[PDB]
Amino acid sequence: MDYTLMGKLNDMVNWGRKNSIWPYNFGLSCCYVEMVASPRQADLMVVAGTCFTKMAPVIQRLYDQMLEPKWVISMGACANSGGMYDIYSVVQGVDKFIPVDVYIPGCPPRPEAYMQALMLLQESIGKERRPLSWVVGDQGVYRANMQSERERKRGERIAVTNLRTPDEI
């Protein structure tokens, strides 16, 4: 499989990083109170809310305080793209200024959607290659171009025929 810019220990390191993930939950807006550690110790940043223009610098600074390796999960349509607030005071997506590894649609997403995002991030971490040391070898991060989730789940989604009618609970 393709990647984007002696071997078993790399899988060991990936397994250690994958099973041990410490989040920093950014409050921001109502995606946070749906879904419910200093940034120095946390390695995953969960942006859950509208990226307002007055606190885009706060998000950028608290992202810059984290240490490599670092991953970003964007919950909610606001953090994905701006959502419904295509308005003057709202940044249209947190991926305008920080790199995002997993996106979850929803307004808000369910907590189980965040669990699914955690599983997706865990697979992404497990299938990537990072430098072991900063003195030996290539000092480049190899992200894997994984198969998209909407094309992976296309067969069972298209195969759906009948649903329950909305007149009952």
């Binding site: 240490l67 490599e68 390796p69 990072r130 430098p131 072991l132 040391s133 900063w134 003195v135 000092q139 991060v141």
Partner: protein, 101 residues
């Protein structure tokens, strides 16, 4: 110069050396591996700790030989402890040890 005392000395040396070496080597492994990208009441309480720790060391020396010193040593240490408690009560009452005035 028995074998038990030299065995315990070498065991204690190995314990200290392996412990400090484990901490240092694990810090070295952490640093080497992985890629890259005021108020005066504080002085008062530290001073009181120093003074009361020296009087504590006097009681440290007393406690290991209570049997051998007899009742006279008990009277001397009781005078010592009463002076210590008088100083402590003085500090408490005149507001030296009251953190929120």
């Amino acid at each position: 110069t028995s074998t038990e005392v030299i065995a315990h000395h070498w065991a204690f040396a190995i314990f200290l050396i392996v412990a400090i070496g484990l901490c240092c080597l694990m810090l070295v492994g952490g640093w080497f591996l992985g890629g890259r990208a005021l108020s005066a009441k504080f002085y008062l309480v530290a001073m009181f700790f120093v003074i009361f720790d020296v009087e504590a060391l006097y009681l440290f020396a007393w406690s290991t030989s209570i049997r051998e010193s007899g009742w006279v040593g008990f009277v001397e240490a009781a005078i010592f402890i009463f002076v210590l408690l008088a100083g402590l009560v003085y500090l408490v009452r005149i507001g030296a040890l009251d953190w929120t005035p």
